Design a protein around this ligand. Structure first.
Ligand SMILES: COC(=O)[C@H](COC=O)NC(=O)c1cccc(O)c1O
Ligand SMILES: [Pu+4]
Length: 174
């Protein structure tokens, strides 16, 4: 049993015009995170983590997320393969994730050198999940950018308790 806010139609999710794959590379901090399986937890608030994008020769990204958990740095590695238009991706080797039948990434907006918003949708054990990340090249972003992220998240049907701003840390992600 679970109950989820439905994924929005893709028509409600903009795509960054003229996406530049080379400029999107490098480290991004997760300054904001929202989704139908994301919940604000005041007892142990979510810690900031980072995601590093590297273009391979074949123009897919190697994507590495690094998180501080149980006193250690944990690394999650995957491959984003260019999809139907620039700024969209599917997940490489999807078969090695049990139960995962669908995975889509769309870069919603970015100026490359400070901030981005990225939309993700997956189907896992037949359940449809989605999330939006607010990425920063630094660990803080302006109020304006955070409010825009909240506005965008709500437009996709998410209430405030499904929107979190992970707390900056120094372990692992420096
Ligand atoms: C069982 O709960 C989950 O499935 C987790 C929740 O935490 C996400 O960081 N993932 C997602 O909700 C999710 C959604 C879209 C794309 C992804 O890669 C995700 O991990
Ligand atoms: Pu995931």
């Amino acid at each position: 049993t679970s109950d989820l806010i439905p994924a929005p139609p893709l028509s409600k999710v903009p795509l960054q015009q003229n996406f530049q794959d080379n400029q999107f590379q490098g480290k991004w901090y997760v300054v904001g995170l929202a989704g139908n399986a994301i919940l604000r937890e005041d007892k142990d608030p979510q810690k900031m983590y980072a995601t590093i994008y590297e273009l391979k020769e074949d123009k897919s990204y190697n994507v590495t997320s690094v998180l501080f958990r149980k006193k250690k740095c944990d690394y999650w590695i995957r491959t984003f393969v260019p999809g139907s238009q620039p700024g969209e991706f599917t997940l490489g080797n999807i078969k090695s994730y049990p139960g995962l039948t669908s995975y889509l990434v769309r870069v919603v907006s970015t100026n490359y050198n400070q901030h981005a918003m990225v939309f993700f949708k997956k189907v896992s054990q037949n359940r449809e999940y989605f999330k939006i990340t607010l990425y920063g090249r630094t660990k803080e972003l302006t109020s304006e950018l955070k409010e825009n992220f909240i506005r965008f998240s709500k437009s996709l049907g998410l209430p405030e308790n499904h929107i979190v701003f992970p707390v900056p840390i120094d372990q692992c992600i420096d």
